Ligand SMILES: Cc1cc2nc3c(=O)[nH]c(=O)nc-3n(C[C@H](O)[C@H](O)[C@H](O)COP(=O)(O)O)c2cc1C
Ligand SMILES: O=C(/C=C/C=C/c1ccc2c(c1)OCO2)N1CCCCC1
């Protein structure tokens with residue numbers, strides 16, 4: 001009607017018109033965290049519910065890692081209508097990340113490039129922040145609004161696996177799921193952790209630590225992967241995930257590629273690209289990972305989602321849930337928009353609900 005259109009066509013280009021990207025991010029985290037936005041009006045239909053990873057998800061649309069790196073805005077994100085929230089990436093020690101400027105808008109492409117470099121308050125800060133609302137989150141989770149916590153590695157860390165292990169020990173007890181983020185393009189060497197041998201060693205240690213947690217505090221573990229992997233890397237990932245019983249995959253992070261056709265002035269900035277130009281590359285990665293794992297490994301699909309169609313494409317390709325972030329362009333109304341369009345499409349296409357559509361392209 002008019003709620004979306006005051007944001008898509010006014011307020012945001014006003015601010016994006018004024019505010020440097022990193023300033024906009026920081027203000028939005030602050031604004032969201034204080035709950036200053038009206039509560040979303042879209043009431044989730046039962047067709048949007050999904051049961052996966054040991055939990056109920058009231059709707060399958062989450063906020064991707066990177067928006068709330070330090071766990072400050074979780075409640076306001078649920079108020080905006082996200083079915084689930086992922087915070088992080090969080091690193092063991094605090095660290096500042098790269099020098100500014102380090103995040104760039106490509107408005108002609110509906111894309112962003114970032115090179116934050118894991119700016120993080122650190123495990124200890126985030127631990128206390130989540131502990132202060134831990135019981136409130138236990139109720140949200142029971143009511144179908146689960147919390148994920150995404151783990152990174154410090155820049156100077158001399159043992160990657162021990163950084164991730166420490167994350168499991170400190171934040172695992174506060175998370176419904178953890179993510180081993182081995183796919184940031186902005187930390188040197190990190191993506192080589194995706195190789196077969198390094199991945200198997202790393203994930204064995206992660207899983208052992210997770211399994212050492214008390215039962216009520218024992219999160220699902222997912223591995224978040226890049227869109228830029230070879231066929232061999234994808235094969236190798238699928239094989240490790242199955243051998244170890246990894247609980248799921250997040251597909252995908254940002255891309256270090258620069259697709260032909262980008263128009264933004266800032267297209268050759270170093271960093272990960274997000275948004276529309278990533279969309280189909282991510283969808284295709286989902287598609288491949290789903291087939292490689294025989295449809296038995298839950299995938300959270302992410303990259304370039306800004307509509308119901310985008311979401312349903314990923315769900316049909318094999319995602320059980322989806323996330324968005326970059327769709328910074330449209331503001332909060334995009335959340336209810338994706339959800340309502342996805343419900344309309346599932347009905348049009350003859351699905352009883354999201355669950356029935358998961359992986360449907362592979363059974364055509
Ligand atoms: C500014 C920014 C910061 C990000 N930081 C993180 C992060 O810390 N950890 C992570 O796993 N993914 C990070 N991402 C990636 C998103 O989680 C997501 O995988 C990617 O942006 C694709 O989705 P989108 O096109 O909806 O934004 C970041 C993305 C952006 C744009
Ligand atoms: O993360 C952001 C922006 C996020 C904006 C998030 C957001 C924007 C408008 C809002 C809001 C939250 O609540 C009410 O109106 N970045 C700016 C562009 C580049 C990437 C960082």
Ligand SMILES: O=C(O)c1cc(=O)[nH]c(=O)[nH]1
Pocket residue numbers: 066089114115116117118119181183184185186253254272
């Ligand atoms: O630079 C970051 O912190 C970051 C960016 C990104 O695109 N992906 C990620 O995993 N981390």
